[PDB]
């Protein structure tokens, strides 16, 4: 009984005989099995008898001999003049749709808080705010063309007033709950909730549509996403990341891995993409905590980041404010609304089309210490209404994996190159200064760069892939991978060939509806194609 | 300078940097499954691909059914599910001839698996559709509900603890004229046809509860058959697939009397799921089980019969809104067969008008096709048969082909003395595949000279078989305690290194990130740190009094000593020789009030945790009550002949008598124990 | 007392009553798996949330008279509503607390303690970059013990850890494996845990093999360092360095007195017969042996009774 | 010996870049690593360790601890008695300051003596 | 002073491996350039191994 044989042995004595098993159809299963056969049979037993006495004489060849010749797979050659550029859609220009603006942001530094200072973010934001003088009367500079702008003005004024009116309290609070005002209620959309009733009472009503089943609009490509990508690959004066330590190394392979990762960490430590990752992680974590804590209050959430200065002083930076609505989340798909306000110095009247879902206010003047003297520039506030998800908060909290992916890509290239020249290639890649990689373009032609530049480019690409997820990206990536593999096979003198080159193309254009990132990727692919065979 | 990484391919080969094309690291935060809209399109497409079949009305369910077997031969390149029984039988016969003894050993190995499987096998898996609550439930709850319902109607045969008895009782249940459903105390009546319909419905696709047991045996047999073939790469994973990829190239590039031309093709199959037919599966099963006991044949043939007549559920329904009264409503698919079509738009109206004939009780009838997943290793064998048909003895010509084929992806190599022979071989392979019911995707397949190809995210250059089939680890905290997370993390990193191709440089940074996350989560920073938390004072007090600071665990101020060479050693055993005697005595004290290669330690604590069946935890109470009398049940399976209550009473009486004899406790409660035991046995007497 | 009282009221409800009455011991493991299937509600976030609140850990009563309520700083360590305690109590115990001898630890976790001795008494060689092919065969990850199969390893484990819950086989044979004597003598007063000792004994005493794609060493010592020796395109060279005869007559008889336990058969007599509880609930009547009843050549001598 | 190093490296380079092998690059790399190892050892040759400072005055140095302890409590008792006996204000303050200084110095010397051994 | 003790062991391993493989390569060559280079290689590494052993004995 221990090994698992007692049950069958016990259930095998039918009087004074031994029977192995028993199983019969005997009923409705028989009738059901009766019409689960090819059309030229009626009983299962006859089909079994026919199958048992089967011998293959000539069936396959005989069937093949009488099939029409239009069923075929003909190969057409792939030459150097075969491929054609991909067609991009045309229409009105696209607009920014990111959660927080990237290139047009400033910070209000706290200037090296004490080493023992660990407090609530609200007090840090207040101390950052008290360091600025130059507020003026705010006024609208760019209407939203869909909504009410005085509501935005009143919201900003209420934020200022309720931040200033803390002192009228006998006890100092920990978090701030905003008063439910008409403009705030309109901004958070608390009065635009449809009512639900059974279909029986409202069967006779008119003007009823299925749902928002409308064909998506078509938009073209602008020149600001390329500028954002260009700016995202530059170096800063801060650190933005500090990793912990591990044990000492003994084996030579440990030394090789250590030098590889040390070079990689040194090259991409001061990049802007790390700042974006930290900003996103902090904002998403704070918003998730606030949403999970308070469910029936309008809480004020600051945008705060931390870094280390060049000489070695910790610094805290404030970006803006977020006001959250009502959050009663039962599943992972329910949406919570909020409104975001951010500071900037960029005049919106240079690219009005870029900002289409924003309201822009002028709020003050800023003194610049660059060169000698002091010059004043206007200060602007961008206000927008949004609401993301519960899942996407978790999606935004994991952005440290992009560094891991970039390191994996670099190490994969190093290993692939070292596998052919059977020796160690970690030295010829990093410390060699006469090697250049083509990762650029200009009216002159193709430019060149160093290893740190390509590492930062890969990190920025991973970050932007994380920040602009969409199925169009997946489809375009797959089809472009297939096309690139075909092109590379062509370049190796291997005589490639295809069966249907068009359908791949129409797939490529049908995965090219609206996303500016995918349009930029398609333009990059076209620019690669125009040079790969010339 | 305008920077774009694609031009980096102008210097580096594509296969060396192909990892820059995959954009994501995990699951994207969006869903594309769609509700009732996609199922209707799937049904319409799989019925449109087989328009020239034969129509029949079921005599036991009353659902229309379409039979495309032995239909007219195709005339164009569009997908066509018109298969021939003779071709499949001949392919199976030739596969048997090529590898003698391949179908009898598998049956013999499967027979012992059939006769020894227990009922617990169905308790693990994904979510399962429940025919009693019309929802999706975990496997254990669905199984318990099924057992309760079957017992309530006099169908009690699964108490033997055998899966075959459960299948027999399910078959007996399917032949009754009335079914009772008791919900906690509503009592609902189900007739024969309604129960039969609810026993053949597939989800939107996890199967039901009355079909998993029959699918399991077929899957085991298919796996046993596949494990004996060299052209199947499905069961294996890792370096084995690399070796399989190398062997086919080595075999086809023998370069003996080099006057031959070799071309490789990477291909994909279009409309794979909605072109297979369960009838050919039944024919294959019947042919495989020749000269075998009849009960084995019945057990292996039950499942395709059920699959040949199945129902597909639509979904939740639609949502409507009004732009004037600020009104919203939801409409279900149960009454969708009679609603007026003026509400919907053009596409939905066409879908409804097309789908109306095949609608019964809110579920559509879908005979010709496989819904989603399942029966992968049998379609794999069906595909491998066509590849086996490419030997010199069967072509009787100059060209010959061979290759390897997974569930849906395939790579092939063709040898011919010139280009015309290669073209003829490719055309013959295409026609032979189409004659059985497999269609090749023309727009996502390509052919080139041998030396480079691809197979399921396995890129093969001249000698490098680097793979990108699975994702990176999570390097996060598991969430049990502060003594198991470290071991889980290091084991995960080591296992990813051993099986996958994680690099050494990557592992060090993954370990760094994991240690950072662990320190942040458990509030355990180093003693010589200025970070202020609630746990800082105790950590600094412990750090100041320690003379050997290299022996403290990371959980309390200690440093990290982990690297690549010591990922398989517990931390306590690693730091045993570098910590003080008093710290060792305090940490490894088996009398703590607090209490995958882990030591007990004082850091292994427990955190605070916050119809049909009247109570859902009735088995658990008895289970947890058992070990208080027999403490070895937590280590191995118990063996006995009597019931549980007999052991309970005997052990309690023996323990009480010995305790009284030893004088540990006085006589006051000894008589009380005897009386309560007598009351228990009197209650059992009823 | 508590367990029998909890069993008494479980008989009041019939629905559990036929569950207890109609279920044999051998089917218990069938019942144990009907628990649940859905718990993973983002465990990492749950742990992070629980670590923020005070008193997240559970402990017993006696911690109230072993750890003070407040420390020198003035922070509470435990609170009254098992009781709720904070990790500060654990750190305090690791700092200030009673000390006990730890001489039994190397004898229980020796399989882990051999790995460090092998590792730190080792040397390394150069690393080679090339391409290689890896083949598969059966590899032994746990060497096990020589002169011991899988059948009697479980017997030894049961005899050492659970002396009072063995039955049938091991109780009727007339022999004693040597290793059992040392295992019992060494662990005379070990009080760590029965389950942990059983698991470690099984780990260091039972062998089991698997399949791995290894292209280097084959012995067991070369398997645990597989992540350090092989790679995608590199190879690192490394060396490790370094109970009497009883027979049952039937079930319990009511004329021979109450049944007795396994450990109380030592007294016995010179041929008395008595009831005894063996296994996980069996009760049988036993009486010792007046002869040898061995397995010598006599069994083969039956061949003399046939083929004359 | 050095000229052998450059001659071997040059000859092997001429041998290699005309026809390549795995082991050929392997020996080139191993040779170069050994070359730098020998150079580093030679750089470490003319420095060694500073054994002259490792054998400083330490023989009699160890035994004066008991000698100092001989007069420690002697002088502390003398100061206690003379502070008790005296009557002026200058002397009392001086003796109190001396007593505190001596307590501090005695702790200090005992702490370092315990730490060093 | 402890790190040198553990690099020295690896140095001996590298020495013996390269000696044996160089001898094997010398065994099956048919070119005078090869033979001369290998003669110098064996002589040089014999001298180097002797010096390394002398320093190893001196260090302890």
Author numbering:
A (entry chain A): 183 to 716
B (entry chain B): 1 to 184, 207 to 226, 242 to 632, 657 to 671, 681 to 756
C (entry chain C): 1 to 81, 88 to 248, 691 to 756
D (entry chain T): 5 to 121
E (entry chain S): 62 to 121
Copy text verbatim from the article accompanying this structure deposition.
Genome transcription and replication of influenza A virus (FluA), catalyzed by viral RNA polymerase (FluAPol), are delicately controlled across the virus life cycle. A switch from transcription to replication occurring at later stage of an infection is critical for progeny virion production and viral non-structural protein NS2 has been implicated in regulating the switch. In this study, we have solved the cryo-EM structure of FluAPol in complex with the viral NS2 protein in which NS2 is dimerized to stabilize the symmetric FluAPol dimers in a highly ordered barrel-like hexamer.
We then applied cryo-electron microscopy (cryo-EM) to solve the structure of FluAPol in complex with NS2 at a global resolution of ~3.0 Å, using the large protein complex. In this structure, three NS2 domain-swapped dimers arrange three canonical FluAPol ‘dimers of heterotrimers’ into a symmetric barrel-like ‘hexamer of heterotrimers’ superstructure, with approximate dimensions of 251 Å × 247 Å × 184 Å. Cryo-EM density for the mid, Cap, 627 domains as well as the Cap-627 linker of PB2 was absent due to conformational flexibility. Previous studies of influenza virus polymerases have revealed that the C-terminal domain of PB2 exhibits a higher degree of flexibility in solution without the addition of capped-RNA and vRNA promoters, and the similar conformational flexibility of the PB2 C-terminus observed for the FluAPol-NS2 hexamer complex indicated that the polymerase should not be in the transcription state.
